[PDB]
Amino acid sequence: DTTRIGVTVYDMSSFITAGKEGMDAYAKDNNIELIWNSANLDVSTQASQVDSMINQGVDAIIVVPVQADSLAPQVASAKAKGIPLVPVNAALDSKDIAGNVQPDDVAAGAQEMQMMADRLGGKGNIVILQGPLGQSGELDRSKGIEQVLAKYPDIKVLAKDTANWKRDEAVNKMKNWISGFGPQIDGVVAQNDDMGLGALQALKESGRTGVPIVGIDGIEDGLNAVKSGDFIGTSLQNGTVELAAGLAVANRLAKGEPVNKEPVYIMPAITKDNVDVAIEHVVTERQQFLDGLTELINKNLETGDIAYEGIPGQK
Template sequence: MTMKFIKTALAASTMLATVAVSAAPALADKAHPVIGYTVYDMSSFISLGKAGAESIAKANGASVLWNSGHMDVNAQISQIQQFINQKVDAIIIAPVNSSTLGPQVDAAKAAGIPVVIVNLTATPAVMAEAVSYVGPDDVKAGEQEAQHLVDAIGHKGNIVVIQGPLGQSGEIDRTKGIKNILAKYPDVKLLAIQPGNWARNQAYSVMQDWLSRYGNQITGVVSENDDMAIGAIQAMREKSVKIPVTAVDGIKDGMRAVRDGTLLETNLQDGPLELGMAVQVAINHIQGKDVPKQAMFVMPEVTKDNVAHYYGQLYGDPAKFESDLPALINKNLADGHYAEQ
C-alpha cells in the first residue's frame, strides 16, 4: 500500500509540475514577440523605414503589426488602443502630433506593454513613460541645413522656409534649429514660412504662391524634408527659376536631386536604420536587456561631394544593406554611435 501510495503521489506531482509549466508565460512569447507599430503617415521616409523595421523583426523571430495614422490623431489613438486590446508585447509610436497620446501611453503601461517612441518626440510626460526614444536630433538637422544655405548665399538675402506639420516635433525642432542660425545673420531675412506637411504636392502649391508673390526676391529655400524640397523644385522648374534649396531625410529622390545639382544639400536620416533600431530596442527590452533611454541620431550632411557614398550604401544594393542592417544596429546600440553607417 505504501509503495502504491508513493507511485500515485509521484504521478500526481509530475502532473502538477506539467500544469505549472504550461500555465507560466512561455519562453517562446519572449523569443517571438509581437510588436504593434503605428506611424503618423506613409511618407517616403516612413515607407523606406518600414522595410528596415520588418527586416529587424524577421532577424529576431518577431512579427510587426503595422498601421498608419494618415495624419489623423484620432486614428492613431484608435490604433494604439487596438494594440493594447490585442495584448501585443510592445508598441512603437511615431506620433501624429507631439502633444497627444498621454492617456494611451498610460493605458499601455497599465497593461504591462512597453512603449518606444520613434522618429518624432512626444510630450515630456510621454517621453518619461516610454522605455526609449529612437530618433533624430532635429534641432541639429535644422541648424545644418540652414547654415549650409546661408553660406551658399553669402550670408545675405531673403529666404523662405517650408515646414513640416505644425505641432509635430520634427517641425518644431527643425524650425528652432533654422531660426537659431538665422539669428546669427542679420542680413538674411526670413521672407515667408509656411507648412507643407511633409508632402510634395503641398510644398509645390506653397512654392507656386511664393514665386507669384515674391518673384526674384527669394534667394534661398530651406525645406524641412526632401519630399517638400522636391515639390518646391518642381514649382521653380516650371517657372524656369533656379534657387538654392536645402533639406532633410536623404530619401532616394532627395539624393538624386543632390547628385544632379537641383538640391544643394540634404541631411541623411536613414529610415531603415532608425525605424529598424526602434524594433531592436523594443525586442531587447522585452527580453530583459538594457536599452538606451535615448538613441539620438545626428544626421550626416549629404552634398555633391559625398552623395555617391551614401546613395550607394542605401540604394545601390538595397538587399545587401538590408542583410547587413541587424549587425549594424546591434553594433551601434553597443557603442552608442546610433547614426553610424
C-alpha cells in the same frame, strides 16, 4: 516565440515608406511580427490605433507620433498594461514612455540652415517649408533653423508654412509664393527632401532654375538632387537604420533585455563630397546594405551611435 510589436506611424511619408524595409529585415532576423497602422496625420486616429494595439496584447508598441503634445492617456494605458511604448523618429512631450529613439532634429534644422547660410554668403531672402505643425520634427527643426538665422540677420524670411512632409503640397505652397514674391526668393529651406523637391518642381514649372534648395532626409530623390546640384545638400536620416534601431530597442524592452532605451540618431551632412556612398546604401546597393543591417544595428545599440553606417565623415 514570435514577438509582436505594433507600429503606428503618423503617415506613409517617403521616409517611413523606405525605412520600413529596415524594420522588416531586422524583424526577419529576430522573429518579430509587425502589426502595422498609419494614422493619416490625425491625432485622434493614432490614439485609437495605440488603444487597439494595447487591447490586442502586443509585446511592445512603437509610435511615430503625429504631434508631440498628445497621447497622454495612451501612454498611461500602455504602462498600466505592462506594454513598452516607444516613440521612434518623432517624439512625445512625455517622460512616461518606456524608451525613446530619436534623431537630433534641432541639430538637423541648424545644419540645413547653415548650408543655406553658406551658399548665400549670409545674405538673401528665403522661404521655409515646414513639417506637420506640432510634430516634434517640425518644432525641433524650426528651433534649429531659427538659432542659425539669429546669427545671420541679413538672411530674411519672406514666408513659412507647412506642407505636411508632402511633395505635392509643397508644389502648391511654392507656386503661390512664386506668384507673391517672384524674383525676391533667393533660397528655399525645406524641412524635408520631399518638400524641397516639390519646391524644385514648382520653380521649374514657372521657368526658374538654379535656385538654392536645401533638404533633410537623404531619400532617393533628395540624394539625386544633391548629386545633380538641384539641391545644395541634405542631411541623411536613413530610415532603414533609424527605424530598425527603434525596433531593436522595442524588442529588447519587450523581452526584459538590457538596452540603452534612448539612443540618438545624429544626421550626417550629405553634399557632393559623400553623396555617392549614401546613394549606394539607400538606392543602388541597398540589398548589400540590408544584408549587414541586423549586425550594424546590434553594434550601434551598444555604442549609442545609431546613425553610424560608414558614410564618409562618420567615426
